[PDB]
Write a protein that binds this ligand. Structure first.
Ligand SMILES: Nc1ncnc2c1ncn2[C@@H]1O[C@H](COP(=O)(O)OP(=O)(O)OP(O)(O)=S)[C@@H](O)[C@H]1O
Ligand SMILES: [Mg+2]
Ligand SMILES: [Zn+2]
Ligand SMILES: [Zn+2]
Lengths: 623, 613
DNA sequence: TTTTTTTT
């Protein structure tokens, strides 16, 4: 028979059970295991999930099979195999991959489909199991956990460039030239003492020809343990997980990803010259599967239905920060920034990103920081930090080993960034931020390190007026006291004020008190909301409109006529673009421009802003 | 030995592709066996390397040979070289020998060129190891050419048996067993340097291009290796494509001269490092001689815009097509790009002909886009932000690599070309002084770090600053409206100060222009000339050497007197007259006139007068 | 030397 050493896990019985789990495994098994009998759909449930996946996989011709734990736990034959994998992954996964390969071969031959059986025989079919176990704190790991799949969550601190992973050794005789290939067993080579040709059998003439030898691809990624898992006692740990094969270079830095992989430990040479190994063992993990943090026709239908709703604008605005009371205009602005404008990358004149930049300067206690926390949570690529705890070097780029470290902005490139207490943040680091946001790119100029980097990301700044409470006596510009260039760089500026409105105070107190009532206290499903925003960004592409352009011209002429920098024009342009995107419009409209101007005036409180003196009438503010 | 019948079949097909290719476009499809003709030229010049188009071998024999070689280039290379030697014997037996004392075997370098595609640095994969590929990128670092020991020779220090033709691995290799069967010397192999043949070698480093994988990533870098004629074939800091094979570099220290493979090394492990061995290198990034370099149609077009007399205005219009307005500023670009006649007086004092422009505009004036166009459209052009920049990285840096050495800074990176300086206002005052002395000297000397080296550092500087407080106070003076050392002010040729205007008509025009720039994107712009056409004309003008004229001497002296009176000298000095002469030279170059014209001096005088404001 | 938080 075929059994796994030290486990009493019969490889033959394992193969038979996993085969029956491959064909004759209805998704009904999974759903019933998950109960949800009110959500069972015959087609999906009665479908042999894995057989359909294998058919679509042959159609795609890929050799990788993502696999959840629940499917194994649903099939009685493979329910035991689930625990077998949990205990002794490597062997189980190897047997399982072989079984998948054989099942594909059977499917092509059984279905007599015109397919290259050699290709499938050549296709190294693999299984990428996921959900193997409940996500456990990495710090919680202990030695006995070694040799087991450990579902893990974390943030990608950094990743190494791919490394040649020696695969099969190739030798050659130095007297008769006869060659032989030694496969790397257990990461070691057993060189032939004498020539494989007994005719020659020359001792030590067999030499390893590095170039002729076979190598694989390996990469390693540092993954930070999430703050949820770690305790207050100490800083989060990180593990340099070793990735291999296609999984290599399958994630950038700052990627909130959940990964399942076997827990691995190895010796380490105490003295490189000698074979003496330190008693303690280096520990790593081999990710068999990676989870990052397709819009189904049903999902698209829901998206378009919500788009049909007129409240879409205000509905999303409230949905992004459901707990926040009021502040609908600020919510709408940040919602637009989440949507972002259109990135018309002109072949000439450079690229023109449709980015949106919103600063929040106003009297404190206004939840601005809480709003920043929300924004960071929402954006899939979020970067939260505070100026005081932030450094310009660490913000954008940090020299290292000679090598460079990505800064906070770099970790936001293609995402949203949050800089709390932006006013407190140093003026020098402010100047650093100026050009990078202006060009959406980091320019580096240092001894031996001189280059530029992509920094296309939105920033959500939170500031406080020079006077702790915004002083209407001081002009708005004086109240903020920020560089006029920097001021222009930002697209929107909400001047939140704590006007003493007994009615509004009553209502906000009601909100907060009600929250207090429920120990654990409409709005879109944040997941569905994110899907909406994504689909809009990727598929929808707003384009300027004739009426829109005419109105923009007239509006900016008025602005400059009343200062209206050209960046103001680009700001309203990108804002109308993001509005159309919010409306799932690939074409801009006059109404988008009108909304852009309206919100521009709102955030600056232009309605209450004094026509002269640069001040704002607090009585006019919120009337 | 191992038959490698496939290897010898590839050898035969390769010699037949080298001799019987029978393809030539000259005289239409008339076949010349362009590889046989290349062998004939080889005999004419008696080189070593053979240039081979990949596409030629692809059309050859259905490209099955191309496929086989492209995968197993490493395995097939000895067979290909042996077949090349066979072909040489067939047609150029003289070249078969190096060609007085005995002439040794001549090594032929089969440098394939014109590959089907170029794979990016990140596209590199272990699967491609040993396969012939081509890689693009800029040369961040290079090495001094050094003599790699291709074929080794050793005299047996116990019997005097001399060994030769010993190929060396990554680590210095030595004979193991004496060829003399009578002798049994396994060491003591005094390397016969004379017998051994060393090939030239050079390490070169490159980095990922901006538009390669800019998405949230640091530009990956590769260590390519130049060998044979390829050594030094390319200049540093230039985007170029390198065709060759992917070479895995084992760590020689482990070889003995995560863990690594062992049990061979023997007990020792081995860790590798991927790299690339370039076979052929191609870059992708006099007046009459320049014309010769041009194509016939190119020369005709040159003559065409030469004939145009509005050409000056149309060129100024072409400058920064995206940028609207600020036409005098675009004129400043054009003039600085044209440069001026640099001359060293009879006494030897060097007189700079280059022009260093400065711009002082409020934020949103598009000065950023201004510099972006400048550098993008300018060769030997370096762009940097003054806020974030290091002096050494800008001028030159000292680093230790086996051992103190030097690294070029921006000035070096763009010496003899444009030097864009963005966010100059934010630039460090001490670094500003470093530039001041460097640019004024048109020379950079690394006196520190023990070494006292010096480099030409000749170039033109496009300074870009913003007025103090983010706005230029017209009541104040330029000197004071912006933070900058007055002596450096003295040696900035120009000062384009950009102010804001509430002209409603101009506001409407610019708003419409921008909105069209977004609506129609690229279609919105329409310069009179193509950037390549513009560069060709510009270089042609560079070829010209303006000469001052009697009327021009006069007009100049009166105009300088008038300027001195106008300041009546905080901004008027002899430096201003020098800049006047340089501007006259630049205008004449734009006019493509070897002589100066009082009209040119009038234009320059108006330019400087406007700069004075 | 160069870059670099951090304290002095
Ligand atoms: N409109 C609001 N809705 C809900 N909570 C609010 C609102 N305004 C203020 N708060 C609360 O007031 C507190 C202020 O928290 P912060 O986020 O620090 O306020 P802030 O606007 O960021 O001003 P700072 O941070 O002190 S400069 C939080 O507990 C918020 O929940
Ligand atoms: Mg707060
Ligand atoms: Zn042998
Ligand atoms: Zn000997």
């Amino acid at each position: 028979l075929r059994i796994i050493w030290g486990t009493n896990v019969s490889i033959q019985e394992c193969t038979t059970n996993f085969r029956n789990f491959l064909m004759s495994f209805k998704y009904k098994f999974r759903k019933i295991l998950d109960e949800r009998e009110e959500f069972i759909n015959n087609t999906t449930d009665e479908e042999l999930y894995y057989i359909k996946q294998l058919n679509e996989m042959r159609e795609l011709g890929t050799s990788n099979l993502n696999l959840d734990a629940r499917n194994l736990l649903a099939y009685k034959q493979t329910e035991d195999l689930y625990h077998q994998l949990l205990n002794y992954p490597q062997e189980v996964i190897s047997i399982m991959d072989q079984t998948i390969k054989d099942c594909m071969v059977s499917l092509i031959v059984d279905n007599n489909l015109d397919y290259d059986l050699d290709e499938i025989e050549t296709k190294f079919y693999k299984v990428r199991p996921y959900n193997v176990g409940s996500c456990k704190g990495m710090r919680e790991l202990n030695p006995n956990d070694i040799d087991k799949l450990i579902n893990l969550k974390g943030l990608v601190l950094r990743s190494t460039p791919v490394i040649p992973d020696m695969k099969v050794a190739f030798f050659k005789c130095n007297v008769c030239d006869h060659t032989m290939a030694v496969e790397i067993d257990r990461g070691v080579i057993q060189e032939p003492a004498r020539c494989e040709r007994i005719d020659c059998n020359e001792p030590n003439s067999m030499s390893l020809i590095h170039n002729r030898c076979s190598f694989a691809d390996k990469q390693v990624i540092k993954l930070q343990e999430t703050p949820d898992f770690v305790p207050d006692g100490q800083t989060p740990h990180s593990i340099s997980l070793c990735v291999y094969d296609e999984l290599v270079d399958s994630c950038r830095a700052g990627d909130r990803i959940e990964v399942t992989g076997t827990f691995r430990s190895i010796p380490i040479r105490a003295n490189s010259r000698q074979r003496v190994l330190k008693s303690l063992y280096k520990t790593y993990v081999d990710v068999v599967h990676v989870k990052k943090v397709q819009i189904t026709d049903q999902d698209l239908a829901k998206i378009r239905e919500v788009a049909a709703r007129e409240d879409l604008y205000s509905l999303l605005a409230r949905s992004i920060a459901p707990s926040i009371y009021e502040l609908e205009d600020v919510k709408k602005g940040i919602l637009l920034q989440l949507f972002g404008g259109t990135n018309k990358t002109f072949t000439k004149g450079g690229r023109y990103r449709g980015d949106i930049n919103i600063l929040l300067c106003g009297d404190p206690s206004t939840s601005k920081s809480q709003i920043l926390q929300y924004v960071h949570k929402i954006t899939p690529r979020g970067v939260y930090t505070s100026g005081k705890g932030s450094s310009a070097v660490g913000l954008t780029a940090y020299i290292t080993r000679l090598v460079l470290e990505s800064g906070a902005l770099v970790l936001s490139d293609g995402g949203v960034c949050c800089i709390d207490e932006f006013d407190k943040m140093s003026d020098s680091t402010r100047s650093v931020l100026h050009e990078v946001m202006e060009q959406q790119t980091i320019s580096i100029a240092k001894a031996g390190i001189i280059t530029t980097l992509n920094a296309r990301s939105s920033i959500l700044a939170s500031a406080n007026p020079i006077g702790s409470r915004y002083n209407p006596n001081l002009p708005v510009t004086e109240n903020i006291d920020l560089p006029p260039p920097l001021l222009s760089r930002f697209d929107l500026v909400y001047l939140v004020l704590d006007k003493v409105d007994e009615k509004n105070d009553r209502e906000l107190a009601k909100h907060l008190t009600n929250l207090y009532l429920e120990d654990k206290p409409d709005v879109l499903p944040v997941e569905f909301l994110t899907m909406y925003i994504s689909y809009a960004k990727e598929h929808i592409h707003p384009i300027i409109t004739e009426a829109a352009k005419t109105e923009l011209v007239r509006a900016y002429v008025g602005m400059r006529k009343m200062t209206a920098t050209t960046r103001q024009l680009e700001s309203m342009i990108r804002l109308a673009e993001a509005h159309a995107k919010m409306k799932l419009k690939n074409v801009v409209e006059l109404e988008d421009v009108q909304e852009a101007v309206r919100l521009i005036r709102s955030a600056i409180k232009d309605y209450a802003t004094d026509p002269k003196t640069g001040k704002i009438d607090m009585n006019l503010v919120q009337t | 030995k191992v038959d490698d019948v496939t290897g010898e079949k590839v050898r035969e097909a390769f010699e037949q592709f080298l001799e019987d290719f029978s393809v030539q476009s000259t005289d239409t499809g008339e076949v010349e066996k362009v590889y046989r003709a290349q062998i004939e030229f080889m005999k004419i010049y008696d080189l070593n390397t053979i240039y081979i188009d990949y596409q030629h071998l692809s059309m050859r024999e259905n490209g099955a040979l191309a496929m086989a070689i492209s995968e197993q280039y490493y395995r097939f290379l000895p067979f290909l070289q042996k077949g090349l030697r066979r072909v040489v014997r067939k047609y150029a037996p003289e070249l078969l020998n190096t060609s007085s004392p005995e002439q040794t075997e001549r090594v032929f370098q089969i440098s394939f060129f014109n590959l089907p595609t170029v794979h990016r640095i990140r596209d590199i994969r272990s699967e491609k190891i040993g396969s012939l590929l081509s890689i693009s990128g800029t040369v961040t670092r290079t090495s001094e050419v050094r003599p790699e020991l291709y074929k080794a020779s050793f005299t047996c220090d116990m019997c005097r048996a001399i060994v030769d033709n010993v190929e060396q691995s990554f680590k210095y290799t030595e004979p193991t067993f004496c060829p003399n069967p009578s002798c049994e010397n396994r060491a003591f192999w005094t390397l016969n340097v004379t017998r051994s043949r060393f090939l030239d070698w050079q390490k070169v480093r490159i980095q990922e291009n901006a538009n390669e994988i800019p998405t949230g990533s640091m530009p990956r870098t590769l260590d390519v290796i130049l060998r044979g004629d390829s050594v030094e074939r390319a200049k540093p800091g230039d985007r170029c494509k390198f065709t060759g094979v992917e070479i895995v570099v084992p760590d020689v220290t482990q070889l003995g001269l995560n863990s690594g493979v062992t049990g061979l090394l023997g007990v020792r492990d081995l860790t590798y490092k991927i790299s690339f061995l370039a076979c052929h290198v191609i870059s992708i990034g006099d007046q009459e001689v320049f014309l010769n370099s041009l194509s016939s149609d190119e020369i005709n077009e040159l003559k065409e815009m030469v004939k145009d007399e509005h050409i000056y205005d149309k060129l100024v219009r072409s400058i920064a097509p995206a940028v609207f307005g600020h036409e005098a500023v675009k004129k400043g670009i054009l003039l600085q790009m044209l440069g001026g006649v640099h001359k060293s007086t009879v006494e030897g004092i060097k007189l700079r002909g280059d022009i260093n422009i400065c711009v002082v505009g409020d934020p949103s004036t598009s000065k950023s886009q201004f510099l972006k166009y400048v550098v993008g459209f300018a060769p030997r052009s370096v762009y940097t932000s003054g806020k974030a920049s290091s002096a050494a990285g800008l001028t030159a840096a000292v680093v230790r690599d086996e051992d103190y050495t030097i690294e070029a800074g921006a000035l070096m990176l763009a010496d003899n070309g444009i030097c864009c300086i963005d966010e100059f206002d934010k630039m460090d005052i001490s670094d500003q002084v470093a530039i001041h002395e460097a640019m004024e000297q048109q020379t950079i000397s690394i006196a520190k770090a023990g070494i006292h080296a010096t480099l030409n550092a000749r170039t033109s500087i496009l300074a870009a600053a913003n007025p103090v407080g983010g706005r230029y106070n017209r009541k104040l003076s330029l000197r004071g409206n912006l933070n900058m050392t007055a002596p450096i002010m003295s040696r900035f040729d120009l000062f384009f100060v950009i102010l804001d205007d509430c002209n409603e008509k101009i506001d409407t025009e610019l708003a419409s222009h921008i909105v069209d720039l977004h609506m129609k994107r690229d279609e919105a712009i329409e310069p009179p000339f193509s950037a390549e056409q513009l560069r060709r004309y510009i270089k042609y003008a560079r070829t010209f050497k303006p000469i001052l004229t009697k009327e021009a001497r006069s007009y100049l002296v009166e105009k300088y007197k008038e300027l001195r009176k106008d300041d009546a000298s905080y901004r008027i000095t002899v430096r201003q007259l020098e800049s006047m002469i340089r501007l006259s030279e630049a205008i004449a170059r734009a006019n493509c006139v070897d002589e100066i014209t009082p009209s040119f001096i009038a234009e320059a005088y108006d330019l400087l007068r406007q700069s004075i404001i």
